[PDB]
Design an enzyme around this catalytic site. Structure first.
Site, PDB file in Angstrom:
ATOM      1  N   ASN A  43    -104.673 -14.687  29.269  1.00  0.00           N
ATOM      2  CA  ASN A  43    -104.659 -16.046  28.748  1.00  0.00           C
ATOM      3  C   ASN A  43    -103.773 -16.229  27.564  1.00  0.00           C
ATOM      4  O   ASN A  43    -103.840 -15.494  26.585  1.00  0.00           O
ATOM      5  CB  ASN A  43    -106.102 -16.447  28.467  1.00  0.00           C
ATOM      6  CG  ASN A  43    -106.586 -16.159  27.222  1.00  0.00           C
ATOM      7  OD1 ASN A  43    -106.078 -16.540  26.170  1.00  0.00           O
ATOM      8  ND2 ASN A  43    -107.557 -15.353  27.267  1.00  0.00           N
ATOM      9  N   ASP A  83    -108.610 -26.241  28.715  1.00  0.00           N
ATOM     10  CA  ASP A  83    -108.184 -26.408  27.333  1.00  0.00           C
ATOM     11  C   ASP A  83    -106.647 -26.495  27.196  1.00  0.00           C
ATOM     12  O   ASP A  83    -106.165 -26.688  26.067  1.00  0.00           O
ATOM     13  CB  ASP A  83    -108.779 -25.313  26.402  1.00  0.00           C
ATOM     14  CG  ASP A  83    -108.214 -23.890  26.651  1.00  0.00           C
ATOM     15  OD1 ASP A  83    -107.377 -23.704  27.585  1.00  0.00           O
ATOM     16  OD2 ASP A  83    -108.429 -22.965  25.805  1.00  0.00           O
ATOM     17  N   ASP A 137    -103.512 -18.814  32.340  1.00  0.00           N
ATOM     18  CA  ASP A 137    -103.686 -17.434  32.685  1.00  0.00           C
ATOM     19  C   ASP A 137    -102.539 -16.946  33.568  1.00  0.00           C
ATOM     20  O   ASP A 137    -102.147 -17.630  34.492  1.00  0.00           O
ATOM     21  CB  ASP A 137    -105.007 -17.227  33.413  1.00  0.00           C
ATOM     22  CG  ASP A 137    -106.187 -17.575  32.602  1.00  0.00           C
ATOM     23  OD1 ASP A 137    -106.209 -17.667  31.428  1.00  0.00           O
ATOM     24  OD2 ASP A 137    -107.319 -17.573  33.252  1.00  0.00           O
ATOM     25  N   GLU A 149    -109.109 -11.879  40.122  1.00  0.00           N
ATOM     26  CA  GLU A 149    -108.313 -12.715  39.245  1.00  0.00           C
ATOM     27  C   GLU A 149    -107.110 -13.252  39.958  1.00  0.00           C
ATOM     28  O   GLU A 149    -106.739 -14.458  39.764  1.00  0.00           O
ATOM     29  CB  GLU A 149    -107.904 -11.907  38.014  1.00  0.00           C
ATOM     30  CG  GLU A 149    -109.067 -11.555  37.082  1.00  0.00           C
ATOM     31  CD  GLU A 149    -109.612 -12.728  36.362  1.00  0.00           C
ATOM     32  OE1 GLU A 149    -109.138 -13.873  36.545  1.00  0.00           O
ATOM     33  OE2 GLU A 149    -110.631 -12.492  35.644  1.00  0.00           O
ATOM     34  N   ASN A 162    -106.008 -23.504  32.498  1.00  0.00           N
ATOM     35  CA  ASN A 162    -107.380 -23.720  31.971  1.00  0.00           C
ATOM     36  C   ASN A 162    -107.537 -25.107  31.455  1.00  0.00           C
ATOM     37  O   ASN A 162    -106.604 -25.827  31.128  1.00  0.00           O
ATOM     38  CB  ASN A 162    -107.653 -22.719  30.871  1.00  0.00           C
ATOM     39  CG  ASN A 162    -107.405 -21.278  31.303  1.00  0.00           C
ATOM     40  OD1 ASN A 162    -106.778 -20.441  30.586  1.00  0.00           O
ATOM     41  ND2 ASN A 162    -107.891 -20.947  32.468  1.00  0.00           N
ATOM     42  N   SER A 164    -104.533 -23.992  27.875  1.00  0.00           N
ATOM     43  CA  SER A 164    -103.985 -22.623  28.015  1.00  0.00           C
ATOM     44  C   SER A 164    -103.753 -22.340  29.509  1.00  0.00           C
ATOM     45  O   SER A 164    -104.188 -23.024  30.349  1.00  0.00           O
ATOM     46  CB  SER A 164    -104.892 -21.652  27.364  1.00  0.00           C
ATOM     47  OG  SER A 164    -106.166 -21.530  28.035  1.00  0.00           O
ATOM     48  N   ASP A 206    -111.107  -5.105  22.437  1.00  0.00           N
ATOM     49  CA  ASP A 206    -111.405  -6.070  21.380  1.00  0.00           C
ATOM     50  C   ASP A 206    -112.842  -6.316  21.079  1.00  0.00           C
ATOM     51  O   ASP A 206    -113.153  -7.050  20.136  1.00  0.00           O
ATOM     52  CB  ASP A 206    -110.622  -7.362  21.721  1.00  0.00           C
ATOM     53  CG  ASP A 206    -110.907  -8.599  20.889  1.00  0.00           C
ATOM     54  OD1 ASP A 206    -111.627  -9.541  21.280  1.00  0.00           O
ATOM     55  OD2 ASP A 206    -110.262  -8.660  19.838  1.00  0.00           O
TER      56      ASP A 206
END
Ligand SMILES: [Cl-]
Ligand SMILES: [Cl-]
Ligand SMILES: [Cl-]
Ligand code: NA
Length: 129
Positions: free
Chosen positions: A59, A48, A52, A35, A46, A50, A101
């Protein structure tokens, strides 16, 4: 901060990530490698809009607030900047929420594509832990 491999493994262990949700330390070190290259200051935008953040590229779509991700949540209740600190406590605390999650470490697509199923213990091999 750019951690060393065994240095990061140590800090993760001290913060309770080893075997957290069943994921051995080497899984967490491997995910951080791919990462962030072990760089706490890592950021990536990202498609979209967003972003990270940090050693585990957490994110802003769901997990932290950066003020610039419309419609997003802040489920770890932190500014995304906190994920960039030399101290990994906020990143580890939020990672524990993420991995709890439902999808385990598959949340981290790099873990799924580059760590899952591999000899992840190599990542902590030789480390004094
Ligand atoms: Cl391991
Ligand atoms: Cl936002
Ligand atoms: Cl799981
Ligand atoms: Na957010």
């Amino acid at each position: 901060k750019v951690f060393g491999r065994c240095e990061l493994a140590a800090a993760m262990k001290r913060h309770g990530l080893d075997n957290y949700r069943g994921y051995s330390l080497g899984n967490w070190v491997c995910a951080a490698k791919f990462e962030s290259n072990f760089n706490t200051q890592a950021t990536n935008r990202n498609t979209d809009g967003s972003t990270d953040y940090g050693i585990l590229q957490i994110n802003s779509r769901w997990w932290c607030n950066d003020g610039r991700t419309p419609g997003s949540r802040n489920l770890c209740n932190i500014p995304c900047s906190a994920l960039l600190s030399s101290d990994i406590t906020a990143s580890v605390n939020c990672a524990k929420k993420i991995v709890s999650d439902g999808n385990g470490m598959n949340a981290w697509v790099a873990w799924r594509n580059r760590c899952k199923g591999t000899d992840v213990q190599a990542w902590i091999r030789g480390c004094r832990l």
